[PDB]
């Protein structure tokens, strides 16, 4: 375990000649060594001697078994010694014993667990978009705009591989809000908006939700419910000039603060006492300190509307499986369930339906535009019907609310599928109640 080689042992006399004893005992810790190595194979070492037959030995034999992850109920006696145990995965009776935390079970019916049908296949469906998103066209631009007059571009009808930006070492910051950047490739959006500008290093701190300052208030602001990523990098070698690259400016004065994604390029104040030009140039120079050097900033904002997505990450569309329990993903809409043809009369503008539980129960396929119904895979409770353990160890199992055809002495009742019980056409007083007029008893079977 984690590099620790643990040994347990026990040594007792045995009355058997050539087998293992039927009974119970526990092994005690012998040694625990911090070895720190991987083990995949092993071999047993024996002592040999040189006889007339060559290298030989007296009779020797051993047994080898393997361990598996299991749950056990262990019983400690008064002296703190383990005297008994239950393997909770051995059979339905042992499961009942573990559930009831006892080695003895009384006559009756007990619910021990639940069953669920697992998905047999996975499918993925995305829009048939072939173009790639022009991110390089924005990031690798020769010039960026001033912050008081920030630019915006819309990205649509394309595939966006966000790992090209995320894993880039060219960026000093890559701060995402509302979304994890490593998961962007699994999402679809209606649109993505890219805003860009040049500011000082120290001003990059203002490019976020809930911020204030000369830039946050008068040049560029993000909303409190912003979802997107803020990307910035040093451009001192590009956007700086000797004498000051005063071509870049920012808004210094305004009568009121801006709203999110607002822009104001008015040049209204002549100058004089208490009268100043609203814009202030940047003294961007190659010899400036790190926080005073120019940085290029790009902000990617995500848009979600009830409409076919036009910006999706990398896609691997598959075929469509029906009438089976499957995993699915419709334009980012993941889940597990059975998909079938729908009888729901959707109107052309409707892409999916919803229940009162706030779940999707029907979708429009992004490629065929047909409507599919979504249902959960079969599940239900499992109960064990037993005589007391003082009578017998034979049990019957009831699968609640399910057909016997979906389960894999098999009787179908209104309570569910009953397996292990022998149905008879006689009638008696009710012993162990099952439901809907049906009871069971020990008559032996």
């Amino acid at each position, epitope marked *: 375990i984690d590099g620790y080689f643990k040994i347990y042992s026990k040594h007792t006399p045995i009355n058997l000649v050539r087998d293992l004893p039927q009974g119970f005992s526990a092994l005690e810790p012998l040694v625990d060594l911090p070895i720190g190595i991987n083990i995949t194979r092993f071999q047993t070492l024996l002592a040999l001697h040189n006889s007339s037959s060559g290298w030989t030995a007296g009779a020797a034999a051993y047994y080898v078994g393997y361990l598996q992850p299991r749950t056990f109920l262990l019983k400690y006696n008064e002296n703190g010694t383990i005297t008994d145990a239950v393997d909770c995965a051995l059979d339905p009776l042992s499961e009942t014993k573990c559930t009831l935390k006892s080695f003895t079970v009384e006559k009756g019916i007990y619910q021990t667990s639940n069953f669920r049908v697992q998905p047999t296949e996975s499918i993925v469906r995305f829009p048939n978009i072939t*173009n790639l998103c*022009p991110f390089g*066209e924005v990031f690798n*631009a*020769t*010039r960026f705009a001033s912050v008081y007059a920030w630019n915006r571009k819309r990205i649509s009808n394309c595939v966006a591989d966000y790992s090209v930006l995320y894993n880039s070492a060219s960026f000093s910051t890559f701060k995402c809000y509302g979304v994890c950047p490593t998961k962007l490739n699994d999402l679809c959006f209606t649109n993505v908006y890219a805003d860009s500008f040049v500011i000082r290093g120290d001003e990059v701190r203002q490019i976020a939700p809930g911020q204030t300052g000369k830039i946050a208030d008068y040049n560029y602001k993000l909303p409190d419910d912003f979802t997107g990523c803020v990307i910035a990098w040093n451009s001192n*070698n*590009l956007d700086s000039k000797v004498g000051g690259n005063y071509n870049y400016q920012y808004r210094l004065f305004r009568k009121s603060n801006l709203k999110p994604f607002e822009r104001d390029i008015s040049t209204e104040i002549v100058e004089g006492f208490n009268c100043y030009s609203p814009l202030q140039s940047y003294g961007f120079q190659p010899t400036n300190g790190v926080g005073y050097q120019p940085y290029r900033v790009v902000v990617l904002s995500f848009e979600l509307l009830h409409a076919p997505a036009t910006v999706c990450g990398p896609k691997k569309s598959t075929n469509l499986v029906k009438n089976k329990c499957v995993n699915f993903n419709f334009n980012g809409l993941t889940g597990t369930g059975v998909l079938t043809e729908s009888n729901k009369k959707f109107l052309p503008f409707q892409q999916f339906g919803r229940d009162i539980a706030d779940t999707t129960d029907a979708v429009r396929d992004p490629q065929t535009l047909e409507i599919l119904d979504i249902t959960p895979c079969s599940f239900g409770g499992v109960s064990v019907i037993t005589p007391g353990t003082n009578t017998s160890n034979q049990v019957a199992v009831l699968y609640q609310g399910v057909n016997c055809t979906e389960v894999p002495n098999v009787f179908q009742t209104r309570a569910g599928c009953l397996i292990g019980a022998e149905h008879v056409n006689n009638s008696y007083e009710c012993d162990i109640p099952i439901g809907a007029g049906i009871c069971a008893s020990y008559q032996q079977s």
Partner: antibody, heavy 126, light 106 residues
Framework: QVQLVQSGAEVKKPGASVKVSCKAS????????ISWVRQAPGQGLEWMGW????????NYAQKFQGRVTMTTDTSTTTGYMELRRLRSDDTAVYYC????????????????????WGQGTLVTVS | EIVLTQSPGTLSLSPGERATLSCRAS???????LAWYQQKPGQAPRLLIY???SRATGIPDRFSGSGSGTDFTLTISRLEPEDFAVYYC????????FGGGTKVEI
């Protein structure tokens, strides 16, 4: 890798026209545009124009205004250029290249150059 | 349009020697809008440097360059037999133009 393949050499009379193809492979056709230049025998590079593979937008050197036109075919991922009203001075080798100097979507200048050049198409006018 | 002038016309150098090639624009050109090319006899040209700070794919590290204002430089730290070719400067700050070309020969 990324490659461009052009047409073979042709000989034309004065007043005629020549069409040169540029078949692209190894990259998404609509990610990068196709640029065109030519070189007269023993001379340097003369820019003719550039076409966007994404939206079909074109830009030309002033010298070739009204003389050179361009088009793209996305289904065959191929660019084309045509020079009209040929003269004896149009004897040159014509080249295409993958462009990273102009955006194909926004038309803005980018940090890049002409790469993945074709083999060149020689056109003679007599 | 902006005209590019290269200098010197031709360098005469032995194998193993260092070479420097200059280009001057008639107008100020941003470094982000400039590139360098190389061409061998009978062959199509190739991009060597784009942005004046970044080499093209497949280009050896012996190739470099820099510049500002109107004056830009292409350098080769050590000439190989394959470097004795014709080089060009290009800009796309205004329209798109190429220089007259410069040659390096033995």
């Amino acid at each position: 890798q990324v490659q461009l393949v052009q047409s073979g050499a042709e000989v034309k009379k004065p007043g005629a026209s020549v069409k040169v193809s540029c078949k692209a492979s190894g990259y998404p056709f609509t990610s990068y545009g196709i640029s065109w230049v030519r070189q007269a025998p023993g001379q340097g590079l003369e820019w003719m124009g550039w076409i966007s593979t994404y939206n079909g937008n074109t830009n030309y050197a002033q010298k070739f205004q009204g003389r050179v036109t361009m088009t793209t075919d996305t289904s065959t991922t191929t660019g084309y250029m045509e020079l009209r009203r040929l003269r004896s001075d149009d004897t040159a080798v014509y080249y295409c290249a993958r462009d990273y100097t102009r955006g194909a979507w926004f038309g803005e200048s980018l940090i890049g150059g002409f790469d993945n050049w074709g083999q060149g198409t020689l056109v003679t006018v007599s | 349009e902006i005209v590019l002038t290269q200098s010197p016309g031709t360098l005469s150098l032995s194998p193993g020697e260092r070479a420097t090639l200059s280009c001057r624009a008639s107008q100020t050109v941003s470094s982000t809008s400039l590139a360098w090319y190389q061409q061998k006899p009978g062959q199509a040209p190739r991009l060597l440097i784009y942005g004046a700070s970044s080499r093209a794919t497949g280009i050896p590290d012996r190739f470099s360059g820099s510049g500002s204002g109107t004056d830009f430089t292409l350098t080769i730290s050590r000439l190989e037999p394959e470097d004795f070719a014709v080089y060009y400067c290009q800009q796309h700050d205004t329209s798109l133009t190429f220089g007259g070309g410069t040659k390096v020969e033995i």
